[PDB]
Write a structure and sequence with these properties.
- This is part of a larger assembly, with seven protein chains of seven kinds.
- Chain A is mainly α.
- Chain A contains one helix and no strands.
- Chain G is of the alpha+beta class.
- The two termini of chain G are 39 Å apart.
- Chain G has a four-stranded mixed beta sheet with strand order 2-1-4-3, with no helix packed on it. Chain G has a two-stranded antiparallel sheet with strand order 5-8.
- The chains are: A mainly alpha, B alpha+beta, C mainly alpha, D alpha+beta, E alpha/beta, F mainly beta, G alpha+beta.
- Bound molecules: flavin mononucleotide, iron/sulfur cluster (SF4) (4 copies) and FE2/S2 (inorganic) cluster (2 copies).
- It is classed as electron transport.
- Keywords: complex I, mitochondria.
Chain lengths: 41, 212, 66, 54, 430, 59, 230
């Protein structure tokens, strides 16, 4: 197929990466902790 | 390129700098992705949020990021002085990156460099006596398969010529922005001959597989 | 008092005798008569360090810089 | 001189523009070059006679 | 065995090169995604590793480490520490656009492949690292992740079975070193991107101390197709060590510089002229050919007219095969100037861990400046040879090595232009 | 190239040529050089006391 | 029972598991020359000086951070070990300025001693020689940052003993300035102990600065005061 199936990329605004990271935050297993909350606590 | 701060106010903390609570919810999504115990890994996305909010980051932005992520600021200063996307000098609206190394310069980037130079006026690496025309030439970006390239704010321009230079710069003066994609036809990264790629509509899951 | 130097009435002030063992040192000092103070040898203590331990997961030994 | 700059000091041109020759000049005149352990003897013909050095 | 190999249609591993029928999970299903993958997943990861080593996947990105050995190191028994999969998507070797095409026109097969890799080795979460130059393509990737989540088929309890698998995306901030094997890992860690030391492997201590691994995007793309298709159907294209299909792209000096899928071997003259327009000015106009990209020595005219495009062939030619900039360059450009600009790029992007790459690229940049201006002696060009023998392999990463190799190729092949340049500088000053 | 007076030099319309880098006292085979060094209020490193013993000087 | 056999040029010796090549080589007396490794800190590898040709390997590897498999043989006095030392020592002295008179580590350098005993003699690299302008770290510690060989020893000392985290690497390639970015006069405890850490003449004492050069002064045993630890 010789037709450009994209231009789905064309509408991308300068906030959309953080928007998708924002909206896809659910089903997040707890990113496992280790002792203190931080290297300096 | 003067990697020591040397305050010069319009810098010199505290410069008044603060975000949006919507951006604070972005911040909480960012340090909710990474696991507990290593909060200090989201420094580069939070600093990316700071750049996308305010076009260049001041030093009070770095103090703000350090107090948000409860880290000493020195790691934020390291990450700010280390990478390329973060310009500690103040810039304009649009930012010009003329990429030219191995296919780009060897496919005659110097015509594009001359066109940008004698169209805009200011020399390479420097800034402009207005906004929206901070010009730097840059090293490779990845998008190599075409003519030497121009990056503006999260957009590309390939397959150039000085009349396209005149058109794109006059239309950024006007404010109407052209497409990120290629030029001279060939609507993607294409073999631009007689379509030597696939032509048939692909079958996929239908034909002979095994252990599936 | 004429040049600003450090004179001394000590001919023995610039002696040093580099030896190889403590036993022959004590034997020579007792052989030649004068008294002596023995300080004992101190090696550097062997340690237990590793780069993977500098990249810990839930141990606090973390490089925090690089 | 020998072309072994870790024993004989270099000359002025390379001394004023090198790096290795300046370092060799500096430490060669402060410390003195190290000499491997052992006892040697030799003797040449002084006009008196056997000038020996041990 | 094939007679040096070429493209036969529908044997393309992935279709939809650019702008084709749609851009959707429905289009992925029409092209061959989400088809009978649960029966592959619920058979056991040992069978997936057997399928991949049946295909015999040579590792991509211009390294040479095969995927089967790496993911067989990834079969550690699971302890209290989880397992991570990191999909690297930077484009170094300037001239690339390797996976720019893939992440711009088909993220769905990448989602398929990261799900396959997460099941096949006990991994639990996959971080996908995109270059910071790619905001719009990153947002296309975010739209595709939203579509795959909105299908309700990845995220938690994938394929209907009780198997959660989350995928995240971390942007780049612009580097060459973040593409490498371990500076990637610490760049995710929030510390500045700097490689670790190798004998503690990433499969033992990785992202903060967990057994992880890093996959190239071409490996992620080819991985569900080998699972859903037959054993060694992929392996029937080319030789025995290297096997399968690869993107050979000319990003550089030809008429219509572009990208083509091909098999593992190809005659180079057919590759250059019978697929991508023609050479600028004819076949006899070019001065030389660089394969690989930028971490590869050059190949001159009398060698490029005969040598086939295999990994073992370029080992026999003392070079290293990479991706997408298998390009020629004209006599009308000075290869000294081109390689000197590449050395300037190497200086502009390199971290400062190791002393030898730092100071060696410093000397080579200043000395290639003195060669473009021609203000040296032939002892200097042999000194550049000696230092390029000194640097190689005495570092952490391969950026110092990939700065050593172009100097090696230039000295092994194009001595006489250097001698004539220096003689013309002698005629100029005298 | 006679060896006589033990004189000093100075820069062209400039300050004292010595730095007090103690090389001459490190090499002086009768140790007749005596250097005690201090920096002044400017910042460049200099001396306090630079003494040649003419008795010990073997030249 | 937890032993490892290595041959140091034929001389067999036993190695505890997990340790380095360098601790065993220092156990048999061979001081492999080092610049970034120091035993009070963690193990970086950024100085590259400790390369040593370990047998049946075409690549010459570091010795400060090598795990010790059973049954090695360690060739310290080979050919290409000396060639790698010549190369590395020639690389260090390129962008290092001619300051050995006005340095304060004339008797106590490390480049000087190890470049006599291990390096080349005829230099190269005719032009070039960039320079990094100094900073103002503290009025107790005089600081010249052109002589910094970027060895990352003061940084590890800060982040692992001082815990202050004010010194960092800035830049890439040749251009790596090491220090504090923000014109802050770094003042903390044990900041006087950084002039003994810095192996080259880049961090010297400010009040001592230019009074002597250490071959004249004689060294004498004594016991500390003002602290109850000594
Ligand atoms: C010098 C160097 C540059 C690299 N550049 C890139 C790059 O731009 N993009 C990328 O995805 N990987 C890059 N890599 C990593 C390789 O692609 C590596 O093979 C990858 O981590 C795993 O690929 P494989 O498992 O298919 O062999 C680079 C590695 C090195 C040593
Ligand atoms: S070779 Fe250079 S770029 Fe690579 S890890 Fe070492 S210092 Fe960094
Ligand atoms: S201290 Fe001696 S060697 Fe050094 S500059 Fe002064 S006179 Fe010359
Ligand atoms: S200041 Fe000294 S200790 Fe710190 S990196 Fe530089 S040379 Fe090493
Ligand atoms: S630290 Fe540098 S300037 Fe100082 S004595 Fe050593 S080589 Fe010379
Ligand atoms: S060199 Fe211009 S994009 Fe890679
Ligand atoms: S001592 Fe091993 S590299 Fe510095």
């Amino acid at each position: 197929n010789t037709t450009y199936k994209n231009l789905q990329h064309h509408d991308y605004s300068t906030y959309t990466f953080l928007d998708l990271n924002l909206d896809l935050s659910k089903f997040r297993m707890p990113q496992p902790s280790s002792g203190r909350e931080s290297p300096r606590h | 390129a003067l990697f020591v701060h040397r305050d010069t106010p319009k810098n010199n903390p505290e410069t008044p700098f603060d975000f949006t609570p919507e951006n604070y919810k972005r911040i909480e999504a960012i340090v909710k992705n990474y696991p507990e115990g290593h909060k200090a890994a989201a420094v580069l996305p939070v600093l990316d949020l700071a750049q996308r909010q305010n076009g260049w980051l001041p030093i009070s932005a770095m103090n703000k990021v350090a107090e948000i992520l409860q880290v000493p600021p020195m790691r934020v200063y390291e990450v700010a002085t280390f990478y390329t996307m973060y310009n500690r000098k103040p810039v304009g609206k649009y930012h010009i990156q003329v990429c030219t190394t191995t296919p780009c310069m060897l496919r005659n980037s110097d015509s594009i460099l001359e066109a940008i130079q004698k169209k805009l006026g200011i020399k390479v690496g420097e800034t402009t006596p207005d906004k929206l025309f901070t010009l730097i030439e840059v090293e490779c970006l990845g998008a190599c398969v075409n003519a030497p390239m121009v990056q503006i704010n999260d957009n590309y321009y390939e397959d150039l010529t000085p009349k396209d230079i005149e058109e794109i710069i006059d239309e950024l003066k006007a404010g109407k922005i052209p497409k990120p994609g290629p030029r001279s036809g060939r609507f993607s990264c294409e073999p631009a001959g007689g379509l030597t790629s696939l032509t048939e509509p692909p079958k996929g899951p239908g034909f002979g597989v095994q252990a599936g | 008092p004429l040049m600003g130097w450090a004179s001394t009435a000590d001919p023995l002030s610039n002696l040093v005798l580099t030896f190889s063992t403590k036993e022959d040192a004590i034997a020579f000092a007792e052989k030649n008569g004068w008294s002596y103070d023995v300080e004992e040898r101190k090696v550097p203590k062997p340690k237990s360090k590793s780069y993977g331990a500098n990249f810990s997961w839930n141990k606090r030994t973390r490089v925090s810089t690089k | 001189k020998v072309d072994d700059a870790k024993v004989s000091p270099p000359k002025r041109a390379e001394m004023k523009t090198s790096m290795e020759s300046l370092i060799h000049h500096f430490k060669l005149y402060t410390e003195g070059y190290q000499v491997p352990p052992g006892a040697t003897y030799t003797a040449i013909e002084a006009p008196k006679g056997e000038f020996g050095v041990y | 065995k094939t007679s040096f190999g070429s493209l036969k249609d529908e044997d393309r591993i992935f279709t939809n090169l650019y702008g084709r029928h749609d851009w959707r999970l429905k289009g992925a299903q029409s092209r061959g995604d989400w088809y009978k993958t649960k029966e592959i997943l619920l058979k056991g990861p040992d069978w997936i590793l057997g399928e991949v080593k049946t295909s015999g996947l040579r590792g991509r990105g211009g390294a040479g480490f095969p995927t089967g050995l790496k993911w067989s190191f990834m079969n550690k028994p699971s302890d209290g520490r989880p397992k991570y999969l990191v999909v690297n998507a930077d484009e170094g070797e300037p001239g690339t656009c390797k996976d720019r095409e893939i992440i711009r026109h088909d993220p769905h097969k990448l989602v398929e492949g990261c799900l396959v890799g997460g099941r096949a080795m006990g991994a639990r979460a996959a971080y996908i690292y995109i270059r910071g130059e790619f905001y719009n393509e990153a947002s296309n990737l975010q739209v595709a992740i939203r579509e795959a989540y909105e299908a309700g088929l990845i995220g938690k309890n994938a394929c209907g079975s009780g198997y959660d698998f989350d995928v995240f995306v971390v942007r780049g901030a612009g580097a060459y070193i973040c593409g490498e094997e371990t500076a990637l890992i610490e760049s995710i860690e929030g510390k500045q991107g700097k490689p670790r030391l190798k004998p503690p492997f990433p499969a033992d201590v990785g992202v903060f101390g967990c057994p992880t691994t890093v996959a190239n995007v071409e490996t992620v793309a080819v991985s569900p197709t080998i699972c859903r298709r037959g054993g060694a159907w992929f392996a029937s294209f080319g030789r025995e060590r290297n096997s399968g299909t690869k993107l050979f792209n000319i990003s550089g000096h030809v008429n219509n510089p572009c990208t083509v899928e091909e098999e593992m071997s190809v005659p180079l003259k057919e590759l250059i002229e019978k697929h991508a327009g023609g050479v600028t000015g004819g076949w006899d106009n070019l001065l030389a050919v660089i394969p690989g990209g930028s971490s590869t020595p050059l190949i001159p005219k009398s060698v490029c007219e005969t040598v086939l495009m295999d990994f073992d062939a370029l080992i026999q030619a003392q070079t290293g095969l990479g991706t997408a900039a298998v390009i020629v360059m004209d006599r009308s450009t000075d290869i000294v100037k081109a390689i000197a600009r590449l050395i300037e790029f190497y200086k502009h992007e390199s971290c400062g861990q190791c002393t030898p790459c730092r100071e060696g690229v410093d000397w080579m940049n200043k000395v290639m400046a003195r060669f473009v201006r021609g203000d040296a002696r032939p002892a200097e060009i042999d000194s550049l040879w000696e230092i390029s023998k000194q640097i190689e392999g005495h570092t952490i990463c391969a950026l110092g090595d990939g700065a050593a190799w172009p100097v090696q190729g230039l000295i092994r092949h194009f001595r006489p232009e250097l001698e004539e340049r220096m003689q013309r500088f002698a005629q100029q000053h005298q | 190239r006679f060896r006589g007076e033990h004189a000093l030099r100075r820069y062209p319309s400039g300050e004292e040529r010595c730095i007090a880098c103690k090389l001459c006292e490190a090499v002086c085979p009768a140790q007749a050089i005596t250097i005690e060094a201090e920096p002044r209020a400017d910042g460049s490193r200099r001396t306090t006391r630079y003494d040649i013993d003419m008795t010990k000087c073997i030249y | 029972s937890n032993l490892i056999e290595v041959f140091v040029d034929g001389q067999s010796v036993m190695v505890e598991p997990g340790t380095t090549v360098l601790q065993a080589c220092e156990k048999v007396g061979m001081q492999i020359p080092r610049f970034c490794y120091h035993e009070r800190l963690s193990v970086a590898g950024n100085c590259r000086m400790c390369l040593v040709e370990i047998e049946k390997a075409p690549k010459v590897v570091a010795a400060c951070a090598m795990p010790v498999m059973k049954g090695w043989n360690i060739l310290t006095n080979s050919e290409k070990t000396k060639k790698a030392r010549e190369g590395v020592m020639e690389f260090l002295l390129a962008n290092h300025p001619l300051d050995c008179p006005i340095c304060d580590q004339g008797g106590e350098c490390d480049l000087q001693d190890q470049s006599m005993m291990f390096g080349s003699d005829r230099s190269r690299f005719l032009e070039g020689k960039r320079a990094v302008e100094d900073k103002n770290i503290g009025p107790l510690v005089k600081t010249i940052m052109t002589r910094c060989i970027q060895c990352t020893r003061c940084i590890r000392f800060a982040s692992e003993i001082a815990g202050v985290d004010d010194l960092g690497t800035t830049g890439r390639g040749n251009d790596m300035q090491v220090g504090t970015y923000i014109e802050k006069m770094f003042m903390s405890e044990l900041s006087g102990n950084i002039i003994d850490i810095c192996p080259v003449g880049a961090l010297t004492s400010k009040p001592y600065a230019f009074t002597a050069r250490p071959w004249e002064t004689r060294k004498t045993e004594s016991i500390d005061v003002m602290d109850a630890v000594g």
